[PDB]
């Protein structure tokens, strides 16, 4: 994985290898790259995308410190104007800075700490280091590198942009990070491992809308608790009233099911001797 | 700049053989099955298809027979 730990902490080490079991880092990297490829292919019309592919990335190149192998390559038709590198928060753009026929997109899977959670600063530094490096090999000199802080769950990007794609890429990143499959699985794993159960939802105790939509419900039933515990009581001027149980039926009904349930039980079985209501 | 674009209509979606929107658990299952190059076992596939058939039958929808039987004394 791509989680850096300072000092051997057996508890943190075992917890991390449980959370990231079964190549989870490679899985989330593949999920994000596939989501980006699908999003780019869907909107390939306005982006003038001729080819949107991915290189033969080495399996270990997902958690590697440096992105030596580019993630996504995009070749346009004739020309593609790219402005100077910047962050996604910027608005100004001068596309006449460069004109290239290729474009590269890189996804940086990072685990932010309590002090290294600055995604924007990390995005800037990582883009500057990787783009300007001999070891890193990028087929195109113009492109944007994306970064995802898993611990912070924060998406960011830095570098050049396609004309008019910057809001598109921002919206795509937000939408993917909202409901990514591997990311959702990782979040569920974190919730289970930390025993932080999701806040319980509030059941629609109201039934005014349910009554009108009773036929809309596929299966529904209702049972009267007092009917099962109902006990017939005798009447006597001097003798003690005999509040003997009547039956075990709960007078259950199900109008949506076109029938009713009669859970008939013995009166003695329904209410034993010296049996409280609880 | 001068790239007066439009708001993208591309949304996150995952499509199976039947085209229904899969749950994220199923999406990750497909991810891992593709990653390892192999899917579940024969018994697991039988269980999955039985569950799919049960869900399809439930979506398409026994008290009429009971009422007809109860009509006779």
């Amino acid at each position: 994985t791509g989680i850096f730990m300072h000092g051997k902490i057996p508890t943190l080490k075992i917890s991390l290898i449980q959370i990231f079991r079964a190549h989870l880092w490679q899985k989330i990297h593949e999920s994000i790259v596939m989501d980006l490829c699908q999003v780019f292919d869907q909107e390939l019309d306005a982006l003038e995308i001729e080819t949107v592919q991915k290189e033969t990335i080495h399996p270990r190149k997902s958690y590697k410190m440096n992105s030596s192998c580019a993630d996504i390559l995009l070749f346009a038709s004739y020309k593609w104007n790219v402005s100077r590198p910047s962050l996604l928060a910027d608005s100004k753009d001068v596309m006449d800075s460069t004109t290239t026929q290729k474009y590269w997109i890189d996804i940086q899977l990072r685990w932010g700490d309590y002090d290294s959670h600055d995604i924007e600063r990390y995005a800037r530094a990582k883009f500057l280091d990787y783009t300007t490096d001999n070891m890193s090999i990028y087929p195109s000199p113009t492109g944007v590198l994306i970064a995802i802080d898993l611990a912070y769950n924060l998406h960011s990007a830095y570098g050049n942009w396609f004309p008019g794609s910057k809001p598109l890429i921002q919206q795509a990143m937000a939408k993917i990070m909202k409901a990514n499959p591997a990311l959702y699985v990782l979040r569920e794993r974190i919730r289970k491992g930390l025993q932080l159960y999701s806040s319980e939802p509030t059941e629609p105790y109201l039934s005014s809308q349910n009554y009108g939509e009773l036929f809309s419900n596929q299966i529904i039933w209702f049972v009267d608790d007092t009917n099962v515990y109902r006990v017939t009581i005798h009447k006597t001027f001097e003798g003690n009233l005999t509040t003997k149980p009547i039956n075990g039926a709960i007078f259950i009904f199900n109008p949506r099911t076109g029938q009713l349930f009669l859970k008939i039980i013995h009166t003695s079985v329904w209410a034993g001797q010296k049996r409280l209501g609880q | 700049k001068e790239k007066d674009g439009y708001k993208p209509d591309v949304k996150i979606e995952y499509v199976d053989e039947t085209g229904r929107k899969l749950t994220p658990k199923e999406a990750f299952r497909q991810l891992s099955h593709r990653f390892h190059g192999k899917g579940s076992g024969k018994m697991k596939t039988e269980r999955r298809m039985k569950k799919l058939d049960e869900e399809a039958l439930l979506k398409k929808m026994l008290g009429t027979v009971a009422l007809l039987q109860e009509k006779q004394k």
């Binding site: 033969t56 | 199976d16 991810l31």
Partner: peptide, 22 residues
């Protein structure tokens, strides 16, 4: 609105090539 199936690379248990297929 249409959406074709999404393919994926089988990096695990693949002896065909050291690098993942594209």
């Amino acid at each position: 609105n249409v959406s074709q199936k999404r393919k994926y690379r089988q990096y695990m248990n693949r002896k065909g090539g050291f690098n993942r297929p594209l």
